[PDB]
Amino acid sequence: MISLIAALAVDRVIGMENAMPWNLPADLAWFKRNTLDKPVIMGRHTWESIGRPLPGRKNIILSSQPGTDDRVTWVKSVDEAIAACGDVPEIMVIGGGRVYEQFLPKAQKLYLTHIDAEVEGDTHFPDYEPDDWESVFSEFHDADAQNSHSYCFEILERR
Numbered sequence: 001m002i003s004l005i006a007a008l009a010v011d012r013v014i015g016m017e018n019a020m021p022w023n024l025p026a027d028l029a030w031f032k033r034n035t036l037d038k039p040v041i042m043g044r045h046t047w048e049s050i051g052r053p054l055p056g057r058k059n060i061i062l063s064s065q066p067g068t069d070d071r072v073t074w075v076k077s078v079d080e081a082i083a084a085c086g087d088v089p090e091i092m093v094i095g096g097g098r099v100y101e102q103f104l105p106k107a108q109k110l111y112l113t114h115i116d117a118e119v120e121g122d123t124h125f126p127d128y129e130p131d132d133w134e135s136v137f138s139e140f141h142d143a144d145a146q147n148s149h150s151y152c153f154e155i156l157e158r159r
C-alpha cells in the first residue's frame with residue numbers, strides 16, 4: 001500500500017522540498033527509521049534538497065525532466081513510479097507538495113510530524129478530513145538543545 005510521511009508546521013505549512021519547512025534533527029531520525037528498506041518516491045526539488053541517494057532505500061524521482069544520476073530511478077509518471085516499486089508491502093511518498101497531492105487519495109497511512117512553529121510559506125500539506133483516519137500512535141517531545149521547536153510524531157491509518 002502507499003504511505004505519505006511529512007513534517008508539518010502550524011496551519012499545515014510544509015517546506016515542499018524541505019519538510020515542515022525546516023530540518024529538525026529528531027525528525028530526520030524518525031524519517032530514516034520509518035523509510036529505511038522501503039522505496040521512497042519524491043519530486044525533483046526534494047531530490048535536490050536532499051542532494052544524494054538516500055541509503056538503504058530505493059530512490060524513485062518523479063520528474064518530467066531527465067535524470068542526472070544513474071544511482072536512482074527517474075520516472076515521469078505516477079504509473080511508472082508505482083510499477084518501479086514492484087510488489088513491496090509499503091511505498092513511502094516523501095514529498096513535496098505536488099507529489100503529496102497526487103498521492104494522498106491513494107494513501108492508506110500518514111506518518112506526520114507536527115512541529116509547533118509558525119512559518120510562512122505558500123505551500124501546505126493537502127487537507128484531509130480528520131474523521132477519515134485513525135490515530136494509532138503519538139509521541140510528543142519538548143524543544144531541546146538540538147530541536148528548537150517541540151514536535152509531535154503521529155501515525156494515522158485510513159479507516
Ligand SMILES: CN(Cc1cnc2nc(N)nc(N)c2n1)c1ccc(C(=O)N[C@@H](CCC(=O)O)C(=O)O)cc1
Pocket residue numbers: 005006007017018019020023027028029031032046049050054055093094095112113
Ligand atoms: C529535505 N529532506 C526532505 C525531508 C525532510 N524531513 C522530512 N521529515 C519528515 N518527517 N517527512 C519528510 N517527507 C521529510 N522530508 C530531507 C533532507 C535530508 C534527509 C536525510 O539526510 N535523511 C537521512 C537521515 C540522516 C540523519 O539523521 O541526518 C536519512 O538517512 O534518511 C532526508 C530528507
